[PDB]
Amino acid sequence: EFLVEGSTLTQNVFLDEIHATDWIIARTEEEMLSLFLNNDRVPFTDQGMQQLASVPRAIMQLAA
Amino acid sequence: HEVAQINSIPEFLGERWEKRAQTNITLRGMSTDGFKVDVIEQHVINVTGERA
């Protein structure tokens, strides 16, 4: 005896696809929070912009 | 930091050989300044899965 249909929500939207994206979001938020608290300041330039981009560029690598 | 070589250069000034010496003394110190700049204090991120 086992679960069937894979816990869909609509025609072809499975539960795990929601769970994984929610994990990605809730991980990026935590990592962004842990970045304003370590460094003092994040300047408002491209230098600071790529610094914020560094978080998703690592979460996607860790997710693939 | 360092005191350099010391030379002697006597010069005939005012009808008399005036004894003289000269060297180079170099210091070493950090830099101070200040300019007004702007800062980020919030974020926003959007995540989408292209094809579910």
Side-chain angles (χ1 to χ4, degrees):
Chain A
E1 45 181 345
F2 54 87
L3 213 153
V4 82
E5 218 246 350
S7 178
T8 60
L9 337 162
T10 110
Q11 193 169 1
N12 285 322
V13 175
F14 301 98
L15 198 65
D16 181 86
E17 302 175 355
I18 298 295
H19 198 199
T21 51
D22 293 0
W23 171 82
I24 281 187
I25 293 182
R27 182 89 172 193
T28 56
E29 306 289 34
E30 202 286 328
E31 287 296 332
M32 289 292 309
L33 228 197
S34 170
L35 188 144
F36 300 106
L37 205 139
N38 302 336
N39 350 330
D40 35 2
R41 316 307 147 216
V42 183
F44 208 122
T45 32
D46 303 318
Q47 207 76 9
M49 217 56 199
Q50 300 289 352
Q51 185 175 5
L52 296 193
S54 161
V55 170
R57 211 185 295 109
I59 301 304
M60 293 307 301
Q61 206 262 37
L62 195 71
Chain B
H1 184 260
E2 181 105 53
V3 296
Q5 187 194 38
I6 303 181
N7 319 126
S8 79
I9 324 161
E11 184 166 349
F12 187 83
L13 223 204
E15 217 78 30
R16 160 200 310 177
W17 291 98
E18 179 182 6
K19 314 173 63 178
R20 290 169 177 186
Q22 76 90 358
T23 112
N24 293 313
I25 292 185
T26 124
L27 306 186
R28 187 80 67 91
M30 318 296 287
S31 72
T32 113
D33 254 358
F35 313 96
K36 316 185 70 58
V37 86
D38 200 309
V39 175
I40 294 185
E41 279 180 339
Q42 265 211 44
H43 72 72
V44 58
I45 295 186
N46 296 315
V47 181
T48 67
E50 295 170 6
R51 170 185 37 114

